[PDB]
From Swiss-Prot, chain B:
Residues 42-230 are annotated as: II. Belongs to the ClpA/ClpB family. The chain holds residues 380 to 746 of 758 of the full protein. ATP-dependent specificity component of the ClpAP protease. It directs the protease to specific substrates. It has unfoldase activity. The primary function of the ClpA-ClpP complex appears to be the degradation of unfolded or abnormal proteins. This is ATP-dependent Clp protease ATP-binding subunit ClpA. Component of the ClpAP complex composed of six ClpA subunits assembled into a hexameric ring in the presence of ATP, and fourteen ClpP subunits arranged in two heptameric rings. Binds to ClpS. It comes from Escherichia coli (strain K12). It comes from the Bacteria. Transmembrane segments: none annotated. ATP binds at residues 116-123.
Length: 578, 367, 379
């Protein structure tokens, strides 16, 4: 035992193991179990990071501090490192001699408790031959006879998958469920532990820093439990603050440092909103109007959703915003979204919904159910939002997906979550959801029969309503109708496309000038309300790019020249040059 | 009592030692009593306390603060969910019976199907119930169980398969939290094979997982929500008089959930549409949420009564429930505030006054 | 990678569970950073807190190698940890840290490297820097919750274009030394820009570097015939083009005439329908000229008409004339809605999941190709 276990009273008394705060009921049972006539061995079972070891060792602390029932007073708790019982072995029989020697020592002390953490690891030692499991074979009678007292500890999952197969062991200890504290209990736990962080990091925490670490961690960090989750924030903020005095920036850790840390851990930005990001955001609405012409209202809706979220007036558990972009083809429905993600500097997660035409294609978003082929793959959607929690999520031509696929978004739009096939949750609260569609267009573009042409603008009233179930629609922030582009827009579109052409040419060492007459001509020639801005690229392709490709490819316009294009008036034909 | 209670509440061990353990812990418990110098014998009440602790169930509520918490549970919920009183009452009645002891031998605390128009707090009330009671909410978006084979994610892969150690997500959630509110959202979206899992739960309080262990739902409140019948509810009839289609919505529910399912529910509660009175309450609720969000930035907010009356009058839509009201709040209050909070006077300001004129019915703003 | 290290240091500086885990896509510099810190410590490019501390890199294979008998592994494992605990100013670094979870427990037991490490991380006794990909982190580290709680995940993203150029400028001298080459400024900038435009299934820090290394390696085989030269943008372009399959610079050579005469080689084979020939010929020329569509296909043209008029023959002849692969897809075989899974594959969990997807594999194998979809109206 001398070099296999740790005397926890000795440790708790001299170095300290950090105080245990609260957990009155947890200890009440542990003691009542330890006080039983037989099988007086509690097992602390729970979610990782809830204080299972904190309690098991915390008991040693209470004993050395005298804060125990006299029954427990003066008893010694020893923690066993089973790794050391194997490190000292090699051939047959040495393990058992060593293992039993420790048991004899516990029996001889008579007033001691052994603590075995990771209790599910006591299964082992036997190998090659085996059948002698250690875990049960060397201790079943020790536990059932009351000769020794053992406190164990385990993760709830390990407990059911491993620590629960051996019924004989399952029967020999009383399980105590350690659940995670609530907000207040977490705050008091921090206050009790706080002096150790302040002492370790040479920092001090404000009342708000502590209050906030708990509330913020709960809201933003969701893969850990409260008592160790809020601590990471406090400890991390401490470690960060400790790196300031290096430039003499000695300071108290305040709520501002906590928010910076939570924001970094959760990858959700929070303080830059007060800095230059105010202008990046302020100007967002206009940068996008230089890329998508017309459609200002779509730009505003996106811009507004983002501003509210950055302002802090977002929702508590919804995507940044979620609206469907409907309209005629070639009017900037996907273009504004692509540009939004560029303007914001964030990842664009683009899915083509045309690929999800069968009901069973949902498995590509979620992953196969356990037990199936594609299980370890995970889901493509849930994974995309996990790697990039701050993103623009674009679902192109959503009306092409099998309609049951839309059901996947009900919980996304409403709770910001989606659960993958491993049970992990996607978190969409920092994702802008944009879905585009051509629903209703075929109808809006149809001519009616009669003397008076009917106004078919109520496409929203039929196709959008028939395609998207009421519960889907009622979760959208908006349904935004993109219009056909006007001729004023076409002129802007043509200018835009010519610039794109100029850039491709600049990269080849040549440049292009187009006269205004030539531009107006191309705009006038290509406009077709029905196809939006889509054909303008073809008009440019035929009137400017084809001529240029011949000049670029066969030597007429290569190194040494530039091309000027002008329109004549007689034929309205374009000129070219060098 | 140790013997007859252990067989009812402790189900992972055989009787000899299962009952002795109750006796032994009760013994130890009583042994730790005369430290206060109060000598004890072990009565039925001490046995019941031990079983309650071993089985992870509630003991006796009348002398507890739980008595008061339970007594006015309906009142607190009515402050969060307006209207739909009958749903609130059904939930609290089932709970009271269970704590009263007038429960079921082997069934969930109660089992309800929440049906009705959208935007009505079918989900909202369940979420608040778990908060009001202080217990874990176990959620399961049923839209994610659309294929016959998705059942294995609820109960785990069969042994020997790639998803065998993961276990089931449902049985594990229940095992970890035996006393909980279990919410199955949009249950009608799940593949019907899923309902077969629910039928046995509703009748026995239990599911066997892929490890052969059982989840005990005896202390779980089971609420599942649905939109079955909504498209029909919102349909307008042909004629001069619009018809009440709630009767057809039920026909839709009865086609999705077969008699075998329906007979295992304690109730099917058809939630009604929200009234204008409710909207006024809803608007105040949303404004308060806004005020809280603003307080977090150090900004106070006043909204006049007329501004409230107007927002409520503007946003009400009987068919869409309360969800649109939040849209009204975003456009009339949050957007203006975001600009002031982000680029203007409220950054280090801290105050905003909102009222409207009568001539334009436009809102005021500013520090 | 200043911020990536700032966080790593802040994690190492924590009181407990001060073990950063570097998680990211492959080829993004995760291990470059962990080794980079050892480099910075030695060079004095780190806070005094890290200064003078030793980072050791663990060979899991040598730790497990030879551990026969019951107890040798456990002994070696513990000896290592003891040595680290007695150093008091060291950090252990583990590549592919998810593999520690698979350390050899001898038999049916659970005593292995992860179970033996856990208490020393919780206690703050030792410091470990881990490294794993987002996929290995998800399928391995994410599952062992207790171990995962002892690491602080650092999210390492792919660098920008400007950042990639800068790492090349820093790394460059070693490629120059290794290959006996020198790289021009244009060569470096282009490796990054071109790799971004043309090389898929890789991340920048690696993608640009791979081009620099190969181009250096190409030039390394020139002064064997004493064709000594530097690596210019043209050589970088050639290397990327090897992968991209359509060079932007060779278009200026004999390729100009191969392309110029394309229209006539096709007119002599397909008669009438000159307009189809022109449509195809022009699309290619623009694409080779550089007047492409940035992200769209070379061109997409529906050929409609009476039978026996050369609609598929001209496309077949095009692929022949160009010297490129013809990918054929008979649309009549996709006569039903569900037949789409033949083109892209079955969803995960379904029979045939690992069979592939005919269209996506055809295109992936042959990036430069003519894709012909016969009788599209029959799909
Ligand atoms: N009363 C408490 N005493 C000590 N620690 C507590 C307490 N309550 C919560 N904690 C938190 O839990 C941790 C205490 O250590 P503990 O051994 O209990 O972890 P754990 O719950 O067993 O997690 P794991 O399964 O990974 O070992 C600390 O992070 C601490 O912030
Ligand atoms: N308002 C606009 N300003 C400038 N260019 C535009 C505009 N609208 C469309 N375009 C042009 O069309 C493209 C933008 O993509 P767009 O959003 O129109 O796709 P879409 O609306 O989804 O149509 P589809 O039905 O084919 O998917 C760009 O090439 C862009 O030059
Ligand atoms: N009776 C109510 N009182 C106040 N707010 C309500 C009420 N009912 C619904 N709401 C509003 O709805 C919001 C939550 O939506 P809810 O949970 O009710 O949708 P649902 O019941 O699931 O219906 P569906 O999903 O079919 O659209 C609440 O935050 C609340 O603002
Ligand atoms: N314009 C042409 N000039 C010379 N030969 C030709 C022409 N068209 C077709 N042919 C010949 O006739 C045969 C059929 O040609 P092809 O398959 O390309 O026509 P198609 O448009 O595909 O008809 P289908 O409607 O059946 O698909 C080929 O062997 C081809 O050599």
């Amino acid at each position: 035992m001398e070099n296999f276990t740790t005397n926890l009273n000795q440790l708790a008394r001299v170095g300290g193991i950090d105080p245990l705060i609260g957990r009155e009921k947890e200890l009440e049972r542990a003691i009542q179990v330890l006080c039983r006539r037989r099988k007086n061995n509690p097992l602390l079972v729970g979610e990782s990071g809830v204080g299972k070891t904190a309690i098991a060792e915390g008991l040693a602390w209470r004993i050395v501090q005298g804060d125990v029932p006299e029954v427990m007073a003066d008893c010694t708790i020893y923690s066993l490192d089973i790794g050391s019982l194997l490190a000292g072995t090699k051939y047959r029989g040495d393990f058992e001699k060593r293992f039993k020697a420790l048991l004899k020592q516990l029996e001889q002390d008579t007033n001691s408790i052994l603590f075995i953490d990771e209790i599910h690891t006591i299964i082992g030692a036997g190998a090659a031959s085996g059948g002698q499991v250690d875990a049960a074979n060397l201790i079943k009678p020790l536990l059932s006879s009351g000769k020794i007292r053992v406190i164990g500890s385990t993760t709830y999952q390990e407990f059911s998958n491993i620590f629960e197969k051996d019924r004989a062991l399952a029967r020999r200890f009383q399980k105590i469920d350690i659940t995670e504290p609530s907000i207040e209990e977490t705050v008091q736990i921090i206050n009790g532990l706080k002096p150790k962080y302040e002492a370790h990091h040479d920092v001090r925490y404000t009342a708000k820093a502590v209050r906030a670490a708990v509330e913020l961690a709960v809201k933003y960090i969701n893969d850990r439990h409260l008592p160790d989750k809020a601590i990471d924030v406090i400890d991390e903020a401490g470690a960060r603050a400790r790196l300031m005095p290096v430039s003499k920036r000695k300071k108290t850790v305040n709520v501002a440092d906590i928010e910076s840390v939570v924001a970094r851990i959760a990858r959700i930005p929070e303080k830059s909103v007060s800095q230059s990001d105010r202008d990046t955001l302020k100007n967002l609405g206009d940068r996008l109007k230089m890329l998508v012409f017309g459609q200002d209202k779509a730009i505003e809706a996106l811009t507004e959703a983002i501003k509210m979220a950055r302002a802090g007036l977002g929702h508590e558990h919804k995507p940044v915003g979620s609206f469907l972009f409907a309209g005629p083809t070639g009017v900037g429905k996907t273009e504004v979204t692509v540009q939004l993600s560029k303007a914001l500097g964030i990842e664009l997660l683009r899915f083509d919904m045309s690929e999800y035409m069968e009901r069973h294609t949902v498995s590509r978003l979620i992953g196969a159910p356990p037990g199936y082929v594609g299980f370890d793959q995970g889901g493509l959607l849930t994974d995309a939002v996990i790697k990039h929690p701050h993103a623009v999520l674009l679902l192109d031509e959503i009306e092409k997906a099998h309609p049951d696929v839309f059901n996947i978004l009900l919980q996304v739009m409403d709770n910001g979550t989606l659960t993958d096939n491993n049970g992990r949750k996607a978190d969409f609260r920092n994702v802008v959801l944009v879905m585009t569609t051509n629903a209703g267009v075929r109808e809006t573009e149809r001519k009616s029969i009669g003397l008076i042409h009917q106004d078919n603008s109520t496409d929203a009233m039929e196709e959008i309503k028939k395609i998207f179930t009421p519960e889907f629609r009622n979760r959208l922030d908006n349904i935004i109708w993109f219009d056909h582009l006007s001729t004023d827009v076409i002129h802007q579109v043509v200018d835009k496309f010519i610039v794109e052409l100029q850039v491709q040419l600049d990269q080849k060492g040549v440049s292009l000038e187009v006269s205004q007459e030539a531009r107006n001509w191309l705009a006038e020639k290509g406009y077709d309300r029905a196809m939006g801005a889509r054909p303008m690229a073809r008009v440019i392709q035929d009137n400017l790019k084809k001529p240029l490709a011949n000049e670029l490819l066969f030597g007429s316009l290569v190194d040494g020249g530039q091309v000027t294009v002008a329109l004549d008036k007689e034929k309205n034909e374009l000129t070219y040059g060098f």
